[PDB]
Amino acid sequence: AKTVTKQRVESHFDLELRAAVMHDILDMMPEGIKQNKARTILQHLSEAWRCWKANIPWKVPGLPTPIENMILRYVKAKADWWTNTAHYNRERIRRGATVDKTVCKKNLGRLTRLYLKAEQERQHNYLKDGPYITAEEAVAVYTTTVHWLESRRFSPIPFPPLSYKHDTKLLILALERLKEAYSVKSRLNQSQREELGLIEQAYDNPHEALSRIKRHLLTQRAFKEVGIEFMDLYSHLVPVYDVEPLEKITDAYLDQYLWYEADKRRLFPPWIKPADTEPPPLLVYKWCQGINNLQDVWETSEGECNVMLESRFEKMYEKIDLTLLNRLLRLIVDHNIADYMTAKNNVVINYKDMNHTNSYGIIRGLQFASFIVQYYGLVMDLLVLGLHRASEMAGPPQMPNDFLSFQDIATEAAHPIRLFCRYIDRIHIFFRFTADEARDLIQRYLTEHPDPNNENIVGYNNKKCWPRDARMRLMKHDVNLGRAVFWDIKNRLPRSVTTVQWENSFVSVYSKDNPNLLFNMCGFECRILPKCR
Amino acid sequence: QDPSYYLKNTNAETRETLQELYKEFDKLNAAHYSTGKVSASFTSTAMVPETTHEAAAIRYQFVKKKGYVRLHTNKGDLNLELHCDLTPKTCENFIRLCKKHYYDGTIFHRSIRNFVIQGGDPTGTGTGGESYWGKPFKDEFRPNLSHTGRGILSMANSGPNSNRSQFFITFRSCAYLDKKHTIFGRVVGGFDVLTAMENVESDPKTDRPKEEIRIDATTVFVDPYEEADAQIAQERKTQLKVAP
Amino acid sequence: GVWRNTEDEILKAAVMKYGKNQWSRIASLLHRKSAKQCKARWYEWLDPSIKKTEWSREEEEKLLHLAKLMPTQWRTIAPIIGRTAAQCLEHYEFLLDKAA
């Protein structure tokens, strides 16, 4: 007899599972029953496994109870084998030991089905268990948003005018964005050639396209379902959405109009990055020189410690409540535009037999999604920094600052929070603390979290790529200061909105104890050592 | 704990916003084929997960064979048998009409030209009277006892859930009363009287008899639906002797 | 984008012959019609389980109640009330124009 090799794994496994089904179905049958119907039981089990693969609620109300329990138990065994096999496959593909295209595509389909099952679980649990955002927290964030909006004298973005002066040029830029994708001139398919024909139709007639776009912004609050897929980057999977081409053209031109509108009203303050003005290496150089050209920054003789914090926002996407986003966007733009924003995310995610409506996550396939993620991160900057310190960042609205200028050295040193940089979700704050304030923060941190065995040192995460001389030295005081700073940061942000993880964050303390300040902006690991030290 | 816990620097209109919000604010039921909610919640992630398998519930007119009511119609004491095995809703409607006098003391509701004669309805229109539930019982024609043959009593209705008291003995086989009126059963006695009432003079506007076979009394010689009611009462009283 | 009655009858016969999961097989029959267009035309217009009726007082009250409370998510609103999203949005705008 032949060995059960790699190509014969799943077939022999399903054959042995079917034989186990036969042996575990022949034995509760009593005397009688000519219609044993084991083929019908196999059809019931195959439909149950297919509906579990499809996340379809499978139920045959005419089915005996212990046969149904045996079916559920066998489907549980097959699902556990499927999930564990996908786990080992994803581990070995991340190691790169296994090089096989069919294994990669099977694993990607398995992970896509599992993630979409988890997302349908999350959406149904959200709609069944109510809003996670509570009420008074969102009301306070809404009120603070209204306060900052009245502080910045922001004239709101209206509905797009029917005779706009540069609507043709914004449509040209949107056509550049849309024709960037189809610049390969390959064989394509019918849907791609249909999208190219729609692009050339809007290229020939701009005016009917503009009228249709404003018509959909006024009227259309029901849209087509969106397809979804992934690519594997062999460490993680990143989704790609699939929208109707006419809605893609509408959202592209709408995105161009709102981006120019926010430029004209100067909605985004220049601490928000990625800005269009500079490359990210020049942004690294700007951040490094802004840390450089502060006053008395390296002199840690009296406990004025330098705290570099680089962190993220973790769940900044999936916890965005669309009704709260509707209320916040009615503040910013026209109410029909905000209703278009609200109804755009209320569409159905589809992948073959995966069909579930998105209602509490965000969709990154939208053109304006980049703008609203930057707006969401802006109001997170308002929540974390506070309105007074944010006004000290931006200066007056009539005379705004740049990314890294203030009004005075006193306007730096009035708060320990000195320098700020938000790169979408990566948050990079430079603090300069005094010894008494650092000791007070350490005291309150140990008040909430007492540690008599001094265990806070070993929970630190350091930059392992640098040498041991280059690494920041882990005594009790500076690591307790950094953990107190991260504790103080985590006390501001509520877990209903988002979270910040210590494992993803990196906090470095420059002191007289520690002559180097370490951070990593984009892909650039930067170590700072003063010439005094 | 406190609403202002995990909260600081509370705004004023926020505080009257929260102030305004606070100011404004089983023995015989084992059916063994189970509920599909557990398998549905196991095969999909869009519902509350269930780990304990739940059985499906089922009285559903637990009757004993067929009943026979001798209706004292105007052609004579004709015995019509309603089968609860054929149609238990029609048997419940006919037995409740015979008990609460929607058939006893009533006139013939309808009569076609030697096709079907409907009697035992207090309204006299064709589907009137009172069923067991107050509203008219569900109409469904059985395949074993259909609306075909001679003397075949059917709970006459214009559609589903419309048979209340009018029982239509069909003197000939017809597909018009099939799958439109609940076929209760067949006439067990007074077949010549039922044929004479079907062949009696009738105005075909409402298709109703001028010589209406009027059931003055309904002597229940057998009653399957009242046997089902007595069995349900006995099953209630067997558990009500210890748990009233 | 247009939908002839011949195409609608062909789509209905292809669904009743080929089931519901098969869609490229249906799109082979329907000329210049993709499977997504066939699925949207079936489940949005041609499905017989679509409530193609008029609104009750309870349905109007629930529609006005849900659209007043949680705003402008018709794919969320419509499975609660049993209508489709185009039906519920159209009838809500009709009730809004009746109020105005």
Binding site: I133, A138 | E20 | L69, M70
Partner: peptide, 27 residues
């Protein structure tokens, strides 16, 4: 033990804390 034949396809309550949050949002 009667087995109905298998027919293949291949061959709702919402929480009122939503409403409470929405009313607080309108206020």
């Amino acid at each position: 033990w009667k087995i109905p034949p298998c027919i293949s396809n291949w061959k709702v309550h919402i929480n009122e804390n939503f409403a409470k949050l929405a009313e607080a949002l309108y206020i």
